[PDB]
Design a protein around this nucleic acid. Structure first.
Lengths: 99, 119, 45, 64, 217, 116
RNA sequence: AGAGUGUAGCUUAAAAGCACCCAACUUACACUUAGGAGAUUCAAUUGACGCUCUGA
């Protein structure tokens, strides 16, 4: 059924008069721009660490499969065969306080 | 008096000019060329040039564009090319740094409109 | 890396205020949730 | 009557069976760029061009 | 050449407690909270706190505070569970709750005749059974406990060929969903290590390179 | 022209496709179309996690068909997003799944359920 | 111990060009705009500091 909940509620149209004052200082926007620049740097660093880990584990698993192929001629065919238990796979996110 | 390549109508850019300013904003360096119809570069303005690079904070922003606009408008003043036909694509024309480039062209003394050929 | 998708922002423009209420369902696990009428502790019976 | 071509066929090395695994034109600008470098390159057919045609200084610059 | 089959497993514990934030992350989150306050749109609680107070002032010239106070006292009632069961113990490697914000890896000392090596948990298999079955047998046999774990696939993660009659070691990667770990003070030398003490426990080249396929994050 | 050596220098419909079970024949084992339900209490966290998983999908050459969502439920409101994913290998399945497992911000559950 | 060696992720580039990230429009992606970080491993073509492979 093509019904979604992305429609804006009708109450958000009348009384848009509560914060017409958006005023900052020059040091505040200087620190905001420095934060944006440095956080682009840190996000690039985080993603490049992620890419380094990804390429390392890709090459480790590819070398593992290739040496399993050259050391076991009857196991590399089933080392790529997929598992039928991954359809109802579930994992919840992290928490703060232990039970 | 001299002919312009008045055609090339369907394809972008149009070749009906005598001197073309083409700006490519790369990842690191922004450059503006002034050319003939032959494809030959007449006037170059690059941030790959230490005299303007050493006076800039970043080689790509509105500031570097305004600086190279002043530089190339000056360069066309000593190069004797006084008239232009410039064609930007409509999304780039609404950009702030290259409309500041257009403002730099206007204040420099190089008109962004070539006179019509006399037939 | 459990903080990448927690540093968020409401991409809409017609949205109200949101405050970080700590919620517990039944297990004693307090989680920050952006919600209205800024409660500080929650417990589903 | 089809005759074999003289030089290398353009847009032939990329012709694969799985074009979706190849990375894609997302923009309008990369295309005109690439077309500009190949248009500046010579070809074996008739084209428009046929008829109408040390360390110390670097260290000091880096420090500045 | 008589080839010796050795399989193994790299056990992974998903972090139940998330990683604490950077102070610079706290600063940019404060800036994000400021801009969220700035770009919101006349929501109803401030309507019941500002305009109601203005109407009360108009009535006096001729409750939100109590609700916020009772919110504060109910916050002070339920004490938050401590995220740090790590520094108070500082030596309880035999427990599963040694660390919470990182992944934990099972790791067992093993006694040979010619060797005595602190190894990632291994087992011996014959070609009749599946390597995934070998890992399942390793989980069900070596720790003598009641974990309910989960795999991702039959593809291995780390291969090491050491000889003295050749020998090979394959490293899988599991994931602990739940576990009844009865009698946590076992006679074995199982120790969960996040990332660092591996380099303190696993010296040789076949064991100092385990971390390149372990999720460091 | 049909008889010149430069025949068909401008043809492009052979470069354009002018137009679901799993493909596991003998050696190349392939998933079908997936459905990842990212369900969360907050629109912001679920939307950001959908954006980040989409950015890891398009940067690792993964075909993404749709990024739609189903309507919420009244209970506290439960939002969710659906990210359809096709294109994996078994090693890539392990790696992509463990990246998704290790990238969960706060209390958001996962799903890799198939179509229908 | 020996061999192959060596420009940010990639270059039969000579301090570049494509990559990459954040901010805005987009449910989302993508485009675009605004911004950002980048390197010729150290000494006089040669030696030695870093990586990979082959040995014990």
């Amino acid at each position: 059924i093509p019904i979604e909940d992305f429609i804006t509620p009708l109450k958000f149209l009348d009384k848009a008069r509560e914060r017409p004052q958006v005023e900052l200082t020059f040091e505040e926007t200087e620190r905001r721009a420095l934060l944006l620049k440095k956080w682009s740097l840190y996000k690039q660093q985080e993603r490049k660490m992620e890419r380094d880990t990804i390429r390392a584990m890709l090459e480790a698993q590819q070398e593992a499969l290739e040496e399993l192929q050259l050391e076991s001629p009857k196991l590399h065919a089933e080392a790529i065969k997929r598992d039928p238990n991954l359809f109802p796979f579930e994992k919840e996110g992290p928490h703060y306080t232990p039970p | 008096v001299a002919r312009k390549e008045r055609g090339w109508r369907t394809v972008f850019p149009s070749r009906e000019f005598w001197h073309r300013l083409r700006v490519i904003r790369t990842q690191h360096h922004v450059e503006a060329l002034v050319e003939h119809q032959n494809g030959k570069v007449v006037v170059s303005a690059s941030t790959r040039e230490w005299a303007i690079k050493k006076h800039l904070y970043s080689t790509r922003n509105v500031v570097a564009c305004e600086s190279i606009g002043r530089v190339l408008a000056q360069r066309c003043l000593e190069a004797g090319i006084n008239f232009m036909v410039y064609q930007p694509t409509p999304w780039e024309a609404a950009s702030d740094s290259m409309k500041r480039l257009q403002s730099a062209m206007t204040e420099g003394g190089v008109v962004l409109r070539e006179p019509q050929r006399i037939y | 890396d459990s903080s990448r998708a927690s540093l968020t922002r409401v991409h809409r423009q017609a949205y109200a205020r949101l405050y970080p209420v700590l919620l517990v369902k039944q297990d004693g696990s307090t989680i920050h949730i952006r919600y209205r009428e800024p409660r500080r502790m929650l417990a589903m019976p | 009557r089809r005759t074999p071509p003289l030089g290398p066929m353009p847009n032939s090395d990329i012709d694969l069976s799985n074009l979706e695994r190849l990375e894609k034109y997302r923009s309008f600008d990369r295309y005109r760029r690439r077309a500009e470098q190949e248009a500046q390159a010579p070809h074996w057919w008739r084209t428009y061009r046929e008829y109408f045609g040390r360390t110390q200084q670097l260290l000091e610059r880096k420090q500045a | 050449s008589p080839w010796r089959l050795l399989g193994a497993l790299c056990l992974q514990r998903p972090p139940v407690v998330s990683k604490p934030l950077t102070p610079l992350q706290e600063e940019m989150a404060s800036l994000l909270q400021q801009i969220e306050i700035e770009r919101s749109l006349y929501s109803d609680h401030e309507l019941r706190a500002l305009d109601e107070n203005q109407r009360l002032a108009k009535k006096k010239a001729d409750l939100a505070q109590d609700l916020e106070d009772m919110w504060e006292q109910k916050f002070l009632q339920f004490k938050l569970g401590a995220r740090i069961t790590e520094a108070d113990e500082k030596n309880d490697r035999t427990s599963l709750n040694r660390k919470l914000d990182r992944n934990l890896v099972l790791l067992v000392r093993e006694k040979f005749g010619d060797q005595d090596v602190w190894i990632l948990p291994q087992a011996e298999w014959q070609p009749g059974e599946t390597l995934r079955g070998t890992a399942e047998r390793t989980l069900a046999t070596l720790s003598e406990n009641n974990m309910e774990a989960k795999f991702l696939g039959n593809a291995p993660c780390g291969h090491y060929t050491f000889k003295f009659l050749g020998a090979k070691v394959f490293f899988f990667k599991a994931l602990l969903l739940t576990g009844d770990f009865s009698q946590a003070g076992n006679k074995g030398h199982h120790v969960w290590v996040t990332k660092d003490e591996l380099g303190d426990y696993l010296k040789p080249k076949y064991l100092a390179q385990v971390r390149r396929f372990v999720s460091d994050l | 022209y049909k008889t010149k050596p430069t025949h068909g220098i401008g043809k492009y419909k052979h470069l354009i496709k002018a137009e679901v079970r799993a493909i596991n024949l003998g050696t190349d084992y392939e998933y079908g179309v997936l459905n990842i339900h990212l369900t969360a209490y907050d629109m912001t966290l679920a939307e950001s996690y959908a954006q980040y998983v989409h950015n890891l999908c398009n940067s690792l050459s993964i075909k993404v068909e749709e990024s739609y969502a189903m309507p919420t439920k009244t209970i506290l409101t439960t939002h969710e997003r659906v990210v359809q994913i096709s294109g994996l290998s078994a090693t890539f399945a392990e790696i992509f799944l463990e990246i998704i497992q290790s990238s969960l911000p706060e209390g958001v559950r996962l799903s890799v359920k198939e179509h229908t």
